[PDB]
Amino acid sequence: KAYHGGHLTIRLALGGCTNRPFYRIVAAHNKCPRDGRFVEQLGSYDPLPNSHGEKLVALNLDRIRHWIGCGAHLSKPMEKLLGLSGFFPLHPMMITNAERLRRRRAREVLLASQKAESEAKETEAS
């Protein structure tokens, strides 16, 4: 298609089959389809653990730096991937979500202790 307006972006293009997702990191005009025309492939992401239990990310860090230097935006999942790698700082919401999960498990642990204490009262009743 003949796009008018838009910018280059670095995003994940979904491949694979049903229940078997696989991603291609690509640089593409933002108005293009998710799996359609791209400019360059900048790596790949396999989100399923392999035989060794490792999720495999490939990053062409030379070309990624080239396209960020030319104005390429980043999708939020790709900003998270660069943070885990260490190439970018950890994303604000990666830290916030980790804090929310910590606060949510603290409640669960406290409730289990309260239930155990309530169960202890049942033990006292016999």
């Binding site: 730096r65 080239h66 960020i68 230097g69 030319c70 970018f88 604000p92 830290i95 916030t96 804090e99």
Partner: protein, 50 residues
């Protein structure tokens, strides 16, 4: 409490990422100039003419 902490993380995160985008923007232009008018570029042009 969480809204304010998150607002500060976004400001500090986005400043760090702007500094890195600028560093990358400079390497692109440095590499381009070296190729266009670097030492090696100039010598080859004259070497061919000679």
């Amino acid at each position: 409490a969480e809204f304010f902490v998150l607002t500060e993380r976004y400001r500090q995160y986005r400043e760090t990422v702007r500094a890195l985008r600028l560093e990358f923007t400079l390497e692109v232009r440095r590499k381009l100039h070296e190729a266009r008018a670097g030492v090696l570029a100039e010598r080859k042009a004259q070497q061919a003419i000679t």
